[PDB]
Design a protein around this ligand. Structure first.
Ligand code: HEM
Ligand code: HEM
Ligand SMILES: Cc1cc(N)nc(CCc2cccc(CCc3cc(C)nc(N)c3)c2)c1
Ligand SMILES: Cc1cc(N)nc(CCc2cccc(CCc3cc(C)nc(N)c3)c2)c1
Ligand SMILES: C[C@H](O)[C@H](O)[C@H]1CNc2nc(N)[nH]c(=O)c2N1
Ligand SMILES: C[C@H](O)[C@H](O)[C@H]1CNc2nc(N)[nH]c(=O)c2N1
Ligand SMILES: [Zn+2]
Lengths: 407, 411
């Protein structure tokens, strides 16, 4: 029932009790582990509400008080009557911060409590959504001094009137398939780019074309909007030692802002809730640039370094990989856009584990996602056993809206 | 019930039916994943079904399921169990069992090689001196002057758990570690406790940075005994760098033969507590973990100093830079001395091909992602994007407690 996690580098042992307050399902069984898999009513709503409010009122040290009990009745009277209910601003703020606190795949959670929450529940149109989003981007960007933030659109009702940001991130580059066979721009985004062009977008058909936002309010058909170029902070990528590196003509955006997740608080579902923080360097240098299925530039870089690419054993992919990542970090730092390296981010997470063990009884963590995609074992998270479990409030995946929505 | 795994790089989907033959627990539940947890005498009653499952498997594999030779073998094992409480495997069953224990090792990226394994039957061994002789022969045959060959040596199975054969070393070949009064360590920090035991057993430690440890060997539940492996049998490789001439002056070397000697081999319910096996190294096992773990040789600071890296901010990636040059040095050194080694790109690519073939011919390939993905450059290797299902098949290799923790000393 009590569970131990050990660090094999420092010999330090923590005891987990938070997992008993666990609530959703992992995908695993005692027969088979699924840790490496990417995706595994009035009667339904009240327990969920009760569960959340109980945790809310406990955290402000007001458990079992008159203010607690009255709110429980108030939400109950509202469910039995309206088939749903509304969160107070305080509960909304608390729910969002805890969805992040509980995100077992996020290495940046040391920051969980400094989340700026923007309440967009009064939104009714896609033009309104666009306005809210532009304000979020500008506030979060903050001329390079990035600040975490989330904007929360109206909760799901009958599921026929969902708000959705069709973009998977607020700021992403287009992807175009060509007769050549190869891909121009970002291959992850080819399909969404087809939908933009098919809804009317005039594509510049270049390598780094910032996608338009595709916004759906109240279950209606979505609409296109171009984020003002002056709000999209981008960084050209150069190297501190390699002058030729600029001639690759690489750039990336300063703001990572995930816009396709569903935020679940007290059984209420927020289908549109873009959130943003700041990049860990490997996210761009390792995955975005170096994934076979993404910009896939390794081949091109190692060539410029005049390395022996005859045999895998010269570790030429690995040499190029490190320099690509040196450059990203350097470029951001020199243009003064917040960014964190994987050594620094993992060291912060470990300290954050310790705090959550001592202050909360544990910290849900998904080792497969916490360990950075390069140099894993020279970061302190590699040697750290972690327990993975699902708590609410939470962020969840949801189907791409284009498969679901009807025109 | 069919289960699908996807490769997120190549879009290939595969279908596992093999997990249906799974026995032992994972540690995981519907409510908790234990995926990153490191370490998560039998009755007649329980022994015969285990014998039965195994013999059913063996006889299917040779296409003789339900034959007279199958039925008679079950009858014979049946009788042997009821009358003696245990049973003996035929040579064929032992060979097949040890290959399948390897085939089933879900944390092993080297499994493409599973069917080429030399098996040495040391079930006639009775004494520690007998064990030393078996182990020297294994070391010699496996080393093959650099052209390494996989081998396993199998000592007598457990009886009452009071007469166990054990090799106290965790690997047949490993370097001593010595804790100094000032708190620092000389040699390999991972082996300090074991070095201490050896010294107390009467080993005269030379006290250098790369002292090959002696074998501590327990036969038939007796107190263990010390033996020096003949040095001419210990193939070692001095570490140098193809471009960095100062690299040799770090004084590093490593041994060619990885040979795990602390696992328990389970076949059809029987437990072989001493069963050392060996293969050849993947370069990252020496260059990332052995040299560059903080709790091991920890030469990263020393190497980056000599490269003249900017070591004032982690964000220069000085650590990542040095780690790569060290791993380059390890691969270059083994290849130049003609000692078999595999780099992590080649190993993981091989493993991916193995895995696909296993799904097609066997209906699955249990695989532990936390362990299969290499400890450097994970995502530029094809295992990183590969979903994997982890489950436990027998025959299998299991952890067991260290014998100094359990052993009843006689004197
Ligand atoms: C402040 C700086 C932040 C850093 C450095 C960071 C870091 C990361 C990284 C590296 C990942 C995995 C990346 C990958 O896809 O390879 C991740 C996942 C995730 N993060 Fe963060 N994060 C930050 C802020 C935030 C914020 C503000 C939120 C929400 C409020 C958040 C919620 C999540 C969630 C839900 C996941 C996993 C989603 C999934 O299941 O795939 N993070 N984080
Ligand atoms: C032939 C060359 C081989 C290579 C390159 C290889 C590679 C590896 C590597 C890199 C690991 C992970 C170890 C670590 O990083 O800590 C491993 C684990 C393992 N290998 Fe192999 N292996 C080989 C042969 C063998 C053989 C011959 C056997 C047994 C007959 C074996 C059985 C195992 C087992 C049981 C584990 C998991 C240990 C555990 O559960 O902790 N492998 N292998
Ligand atoms: C806020 C933030 C900070 C940061 N440093 N990186 C990121 C990008 C990583 C990230 C985080 C959460 C969520 C995602 C994508 C979720 C996602 C992923 C896939 C493959 N399919 C879906 N339907 C949904 C990606 C975001
Ligand atoms: C044959 C072989 C080939 C290779 N390339 N690498 C290795 C080393 C990795 C390896 C493999 C199996 C087993 C171990 C040790 C596991 C181990 C760990 C603990 C704590 N207790 C135990 N009883 C056992 C280590 C071995
Ligand atoms: C805590 C964590 O599970 C532990 O450090 C593991 C992770 N993955 C590993 N993977 C390999 N190949 N070898 C190891 O020793 C470890 N250590
Ligand atoms: C198959 C495997 O689950 C998949 O490659 C995962 C592994 N770890 C990851 N880790 C991070 N941080 N991001 C990812 O997209 C993935 N992909
Ligand atoms: Zn699991």
């Amino acid at each position: 029932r009590f569970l131990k996690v050990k660090n094999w580098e420092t010999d330090v042992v923590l005891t987990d009790t938070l997992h008993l307050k666990s609530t959703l399902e992992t995908g695993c069984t005692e027969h088979i582990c699924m840790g490496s898999i990417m995706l595994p009513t009035k009667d339904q709503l009240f327990p969920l509400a009760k569960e959340f409010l109980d945790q809310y009122y406990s955290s402000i040290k007001r458990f079992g008080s008159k203010a607690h009990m009255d709110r429980l009745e108030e939400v109950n009277k509202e469910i039995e009557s309206t088939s749903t209910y509304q969160l107070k601003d305080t509960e909304l703020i608390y729910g969002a911060k805890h969805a992040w606190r509980n995100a077992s795949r996020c290495v940046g959670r040391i920051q969980w409590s400094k989340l700026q929450v923007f309440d967009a529940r009064d939104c009714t149109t896609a033009h309104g959504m666009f306005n809210y989003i532009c304000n979020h981007v500008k506030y979060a960007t903050n001329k390079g001094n990035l600040r975490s933030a989330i904007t929360i659109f109206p909760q799901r009702t009958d599921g026929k009137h969902d708000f959705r940001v069709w973009n998977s991130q607020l700021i992403r580059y287009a992807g175009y398939k060509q007769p050549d066979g190869s891909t121009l721009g970002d291959p992850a985004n080819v399909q969404f780019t087809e939908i933009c062009i098919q809804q009317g977008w005039k594509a510049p058909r270049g390598r780094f074309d910032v996608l338009p936002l595709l916004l759906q309010a109240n279950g209606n058909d979505p609409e296109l909007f171009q984020i003002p170029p002056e709000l999209v902070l981008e960084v050209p990528i150069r190297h501190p030692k390699f002058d030729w590196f600029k001639d690759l003509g690489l750039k990336w955006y300063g703001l990572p802002a995930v816009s396709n997740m569903l935020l679940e608080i007290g059984g209420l579902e927020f289908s549109a809730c873009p959130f943003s923080g700041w990049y860990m360097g490997t996210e761009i240098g390792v995955r975005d640039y170096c994934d076979n299925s993404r910009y896939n530039i390794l081949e091109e870089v190692a060539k410029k370094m005049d390395l022996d690419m005859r045999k895998t054993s010269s570790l030429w992919k690995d040499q190029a990989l490190v320099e690509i990542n040196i450059a990203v970090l350097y470029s951001f730092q020199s243009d003064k856009v917040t960014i964190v390296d994987h050594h620094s981010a993992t060291e912060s997470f470990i300290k954050h584990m310790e705090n959550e063990y001592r202050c909360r009884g544990g910290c849900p963590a998904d080792w497969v996602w916490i360990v950075p995609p390069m140099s894993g074992s020279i970061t302190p998270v590699f040697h750290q056993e972690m327990l993975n479990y699902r708590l609410t409030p939470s962020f969840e995946y949801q189907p791409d809206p284009w498969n679901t929505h009807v025109w």
